[PDB]
Amino acid sequence: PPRPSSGELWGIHLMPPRILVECLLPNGMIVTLECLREATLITIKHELFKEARKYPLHQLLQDESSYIFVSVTQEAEREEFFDETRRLCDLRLFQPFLKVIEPVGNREEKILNREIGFAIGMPVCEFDMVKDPEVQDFRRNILNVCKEAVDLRDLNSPHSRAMYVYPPNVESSPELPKHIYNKLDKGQIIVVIWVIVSPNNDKQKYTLKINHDCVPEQVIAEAIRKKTRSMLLSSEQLKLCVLEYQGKYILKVCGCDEYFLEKYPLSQYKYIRSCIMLGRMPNLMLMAKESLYSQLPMDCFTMPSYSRETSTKSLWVINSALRIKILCATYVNVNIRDKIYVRTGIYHGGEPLCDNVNTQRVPCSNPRWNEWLNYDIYIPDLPRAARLCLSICSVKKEEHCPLAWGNINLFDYTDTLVSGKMALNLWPVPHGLEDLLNPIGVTGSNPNKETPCLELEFDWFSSVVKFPDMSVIEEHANWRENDKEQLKAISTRDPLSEITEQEKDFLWSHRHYCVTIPEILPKLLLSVKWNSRDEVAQMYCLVKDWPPIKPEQAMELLDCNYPDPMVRGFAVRCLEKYLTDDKLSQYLIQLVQVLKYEQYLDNLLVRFLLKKALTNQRIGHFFFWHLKSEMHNKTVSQRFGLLLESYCRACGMYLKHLNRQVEAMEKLINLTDILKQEKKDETQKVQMKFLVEQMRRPDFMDALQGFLSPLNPAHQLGNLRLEECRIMSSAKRPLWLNWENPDIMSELLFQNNEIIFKNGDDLRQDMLTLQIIRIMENIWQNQGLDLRMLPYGCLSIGDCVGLIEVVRNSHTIMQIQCKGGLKGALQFNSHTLHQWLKDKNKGEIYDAAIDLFTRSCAGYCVATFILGIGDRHNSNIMVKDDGQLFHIDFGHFLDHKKKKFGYKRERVPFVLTQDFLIVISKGAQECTKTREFERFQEMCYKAYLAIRQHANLFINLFSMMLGSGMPELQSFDDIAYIRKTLALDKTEQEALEYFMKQMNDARHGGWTTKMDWIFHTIKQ
Amino acid sequence: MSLQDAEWYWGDISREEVNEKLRDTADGTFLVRDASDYTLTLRKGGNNKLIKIFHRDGKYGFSDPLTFSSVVELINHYRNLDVKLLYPVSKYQQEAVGKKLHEYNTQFQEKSREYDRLYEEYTRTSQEIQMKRTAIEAFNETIKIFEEQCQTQERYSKEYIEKFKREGNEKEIQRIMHNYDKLKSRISEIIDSRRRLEEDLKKQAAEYREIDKRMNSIKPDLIQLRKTRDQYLMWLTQK
Ligand SMILES: Cc1cc([C@@H](C)Nc2ccccc2C(=O)O)c2oc(N3CCC(C)(C)CC3)c(C)c(=O)c2c1
């Protein structure tokens, strides 16, 4: 069991400066020794063996080198501390004692397992103790994918390793939209390649003008030419110079660790494309290939220590209906304020296969049924994804109610069918769950064996049942006109569009034609009757030979509506062939969340994701963090922890950097815990006093300086600029942290790294929002609509704990109004925004900054409408000095639809319509109607329609993010909001009227209302 | 039989207000809706099926051969695998009865608050239990180490102790015995801290189930207080 707090001892957040430590010596002598809380094990051992010569049996003490410290951690394990640099407080001790022993066993294995356990947040030994055969079979077998990935890493010994660690950060397509192509000079771009010439860094430039579509090797060649111009060489001599030394060098981004290792167009690289769009000049750095491969570890992979006639008929042979016995329940916490019954039912994912059957009403105090329930369904008609959802409910007849639920996969991971006696510990009911069963609920028995444990007996047949192999299903499978107008219209309707029974059977009938229009496969699968081996067998054979569809559409087949294994296998194969690494990073959140839905531990999706994580560290990093940030939840803990064990046992030497990140986050969690709990009611001056005091201590400085930012491990975090670090005003007690950028030329990118660490709020909302904002900006730019967004980084690292990128030199409109000053006027006056933008952008800069403002503002307005985001006043919208607008605080989904009662959204007043209308076109008291506002409107309209054109994508995104128990993402009814904002039922040209009407209404409502500054109440 | 009779017909009420109007209901509970037109929502197989009614030339039907020219004859035809319809969802289900709809909502919110003032003290208790479970596990292993430490003593020492006795040095062995005695003392002290933590374990295991019982008593009420406070459409800012 993982430890509950990030304290240094059990129930103490911080060790007092001086602690008494009971040292158990290797001669059986106990010696209490006063240690400093920050003291290393080295010095503690030294001062122990010094003051231990005072105690008897002192001659037996060997050299202190030949001994190692051992103790009990807060996880309740024996940690043998092999690293003796570690400080006392960083030991995570249960209580302050230290046993001194001599080393035993293999040291390498002990160390590696301890590092894996630290990374996870759970000691690895707990997995060894687990007895479920599926768990150990997964642990053993998944190493196949691990070995394959490490083999691909060492396939090209020098280069492939570099590709694994520093994969090319590129866009999906090299095709450069034309409004971007125009931004550069006649099809080419200005670039600056730098060279570091000596150690105590001197620097020399090479300003090149290069075709925008050149590969890195070609850029290096042009730089070599630049240098070998002053050189005295023949024409064929220059030729031989370049030819031989083209590929003896490599390019890096000045100021971060992103390298141009692959043969891509320079514009396809995200950094250079960014430079083009933003008009900034790319600053690269030349570097000898040897000078990089030297800094690679050569990390290998070695197998762990856990890598160590029966009568069977097929399921197609059994003739009977499914029947299961309900024996008894250990206990129920009933008040006897009323009779209970066991409601059961067989389900194929969300929907039940047959009709739900119940047990009899029995005494509440004495719980026994012992009754053989029959289910109205045929046994061979069972699909592969069949499973049993059941629950214990109560009565007053008058008022039903559920108490403890449970789900079980009706087949094994081996394909065997359940039979005989079984005990299932039940799970509790979520806070606001009033359903009689838990269908979407996780499958399997409760690890907590103390909660209610139901016992039952499934039907035992003559032999051991199994689900038939695919060939038998194909054997079974082997037994017009023109209605195509519809097929090319129902395949274009969003996933949540109703599927009528007429259309269901119309699709199932003309199914062998559907292959022509492959993207209709989702809808088609929903129109199948899954409790029929007949239709299931036919559909299987259609699935196997189905045309690969675009990856964005195949993701749909991985959400909850499609639980059949062949469907998911098809989607996984689609991803394996057609999905780019770029978008795999882009959609990783949904891909990780979707692992939960799969029936069994070992499957095709987990293997695919683990392989791609062990093949690309930019995937593997966020793969790791997304899995670790869900280890707090017990329902997923085991699956995600086993997967994390698999990854950490193969990622190689990045594991140590991950450990550094974990260590740092742990210290931050603990510090904020103190600020929130113990020092709750202290003034801010004293909390900041404590903050400075505690950060300056060496355990913190060492632990939280020099590591990779989890927000983007391409950024190194250097030394803390403490004078900038501060506690934020927010009640939840955040931490504003500032690092130097250690990069050799941090001058050419990030001067300062600034991150917010907040311990309090759930960030999954913000994360999903920003990811969607990012997707939208991508869509608009591919369609030649230059709307510059700012989807700042955000990463949840644990239960309501995460990180937030800071945007340099940005301010809230609240600020700009106040920050701009009073200037003699108690009131900001609302105009001020325009004059603050004018005071920071003068001359010709003014017009371009205004363009930036309007282009950003339009996109953010459209996105704030399409997505259910309200609460948009002068404290959520921010402006940079160059004039880029961007929104923050994406806390609520789908317009608080879950929240409150549901009778609003008829009227929404936007406060700052005038304040922006002044910037979007200067002056002119009538800026209700100017040419520039007309251009603003056209932009917003085009953006709205552009998202509407791709709507299915966002529907699928939200539908995949239903695995996460998010506040405003629980049922499809939630997701149905964007169907209304986009008006997918209304025709393309009716939806533009929808949008324009809503916008006009909000604008005028804003013209009238009053803001009441601080509390933002109204006056009308 | 008319355009709107108020027996099984609603307007364009969303799909969110259908599933819950026939959730966990028998094979039958049905209603008529509108489409992007008419719609028929039906229940069978433990599932919710959706059938469209094509209305062209003022006529209605399902299959290809049209067999009706009105809305309400269609229902009674099949009413008495096209399985029949059973139970309809009535429209009139319970002078200016609006003020009374405070007293029935004031229960829910307060009964929600009192449930929230319980689920919190359920979660807080729940995790607090697991904490103590692990701490006992910690103490156990800690004890083992000290018991192993004692084995190290009564083995390395019993060669010096049984060497000074044959040499004459009692108050040297008295130091070794003072040490061993303090070692055993720090064993019994840990055992007692662990026994007290098991006492708190069972205290919290009883308090936990009391919280669970109270929740099991409260829960049936909140669901029934959900259907009593339904709103009336078309009216603004009722409190
Ligand atoms: C200049 C401006 C105008 C608007 C609206 C009021 N006007 C139009 C917008 C587009 C096209 C035409 C008009 C028109 O009325 O002609 C803005 O709306 C929002 N919101 C998003 C939509 C909400 C309902 C949530 C209100 C908040 C934000 C955040 C703005 O920055 C914004 C800026």
Ligand SMILES: Cc1nc(NC(=O)N2CCC[C@H]2C(N)=O)sc1-c1csc(C(C)(C)C)n1
């Ligand atoms: C994106 C983002 N950028 C920020 N930058 C700044 O605040 N500043 C930059 C230098 C001056 C200073 C200022 N304006 O006071 S905070 C933030 C942000 C994102 S979510 C968030 C909540 C804490 C409100 C949740 N906050």
